[PDB]
Amino acid sequence: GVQVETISPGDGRTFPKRGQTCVVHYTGMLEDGKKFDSSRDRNKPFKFMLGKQEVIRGWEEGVAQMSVGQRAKLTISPDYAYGATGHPGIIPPHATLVFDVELLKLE
């Protein structure tokens, strides 16, 4: 399913734990790279506790494969993403995503 690919190493250590207040920058574009988001576009960092399960399954799994300070592309599978639903008018059904994840800090 999800097939995360590292961009740059961070600490190379601490993988995310349940309940950590993960804090990141990132950007999101489609399988074909059509841009749809960036936290930098707000400049304000995206923030999310992980194990809070608020995110798509491939994000909760994909961040877990990363470590503190680490940067990585995340090519989340649709089943782990919005999938057959798609993102209502945003992401078409069964569409894999691509994320330039940039974890600022696990908390």
Partner 1 sequence: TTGEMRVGWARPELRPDVELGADELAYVFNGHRGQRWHLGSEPFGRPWQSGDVVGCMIDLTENTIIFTLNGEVLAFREIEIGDGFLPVCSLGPGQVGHLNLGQDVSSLRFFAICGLQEGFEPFAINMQRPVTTWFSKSLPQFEPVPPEHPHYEVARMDLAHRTWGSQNSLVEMLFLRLSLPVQFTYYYSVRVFACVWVGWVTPDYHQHDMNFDLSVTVTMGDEQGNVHSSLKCSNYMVWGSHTDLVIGCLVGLMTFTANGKESNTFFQVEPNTKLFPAVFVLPTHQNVIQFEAAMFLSERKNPAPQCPPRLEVQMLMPVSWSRMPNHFLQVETRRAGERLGWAVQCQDPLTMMALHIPEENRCMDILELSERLDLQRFHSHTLRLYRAVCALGNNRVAHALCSHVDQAQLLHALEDAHLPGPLRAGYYDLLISIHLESACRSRRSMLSEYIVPLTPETRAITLFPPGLPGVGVTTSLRPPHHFSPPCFVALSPAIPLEALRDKALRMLGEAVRDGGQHARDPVGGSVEFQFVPVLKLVSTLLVMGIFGDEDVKQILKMIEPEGLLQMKLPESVKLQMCNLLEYFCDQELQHRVESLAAFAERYVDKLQANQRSRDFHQDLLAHCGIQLETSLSSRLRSLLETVRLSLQELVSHMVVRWAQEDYVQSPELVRAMFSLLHRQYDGLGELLRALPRAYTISPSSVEDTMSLLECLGQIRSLLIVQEENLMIQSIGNIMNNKVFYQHPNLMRALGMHETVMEVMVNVLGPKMVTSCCRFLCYFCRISRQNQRSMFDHLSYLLENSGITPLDVAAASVIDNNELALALQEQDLEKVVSYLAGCGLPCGGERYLDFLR
Partner 2 sequence: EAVILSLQDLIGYFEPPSEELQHEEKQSKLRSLRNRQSLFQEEGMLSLVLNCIDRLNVYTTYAGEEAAESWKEIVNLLYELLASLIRGNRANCALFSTNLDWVVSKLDRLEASSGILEVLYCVLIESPEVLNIIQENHIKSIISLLDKHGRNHKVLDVLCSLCVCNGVAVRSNQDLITENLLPGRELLLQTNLINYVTSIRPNIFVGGKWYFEVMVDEVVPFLTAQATHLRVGWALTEGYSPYPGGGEGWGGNGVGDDLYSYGFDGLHLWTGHVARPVTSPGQHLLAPEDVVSCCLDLSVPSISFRINGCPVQGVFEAFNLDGLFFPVVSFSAGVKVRFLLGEFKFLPPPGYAPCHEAVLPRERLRLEPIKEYRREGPRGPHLVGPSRCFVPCPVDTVQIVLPPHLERIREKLAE
Active-site hit among 46, 56, 76, 80 = 56
Q: Contact between 2 and partner 2 (CB under 8 A)?
A: no
In degrees, to the nearest 5, what angle opens at C-alpha 21 toward C-alphas 18 and 27? 110
| Smallest separation, CB 92 to partner 2 (Å) | 4
Active-site hit among 11, 15, 36, 90 = 36
Under 8 Å CB-to-CB from 47, ≥6 apart: which residues?
21, 22, 23, 24
Q: Contact between 57 and partner 2 (CB under 8 A)?
A: no
Under 8 Å CB-to-CB from 1, ≥6 apart: which residues?
58, 77, 79, 80
Active site residue 48: no
65, interface contact from partner 2, partner 1, none, CB < 5-8 Å by kind: none
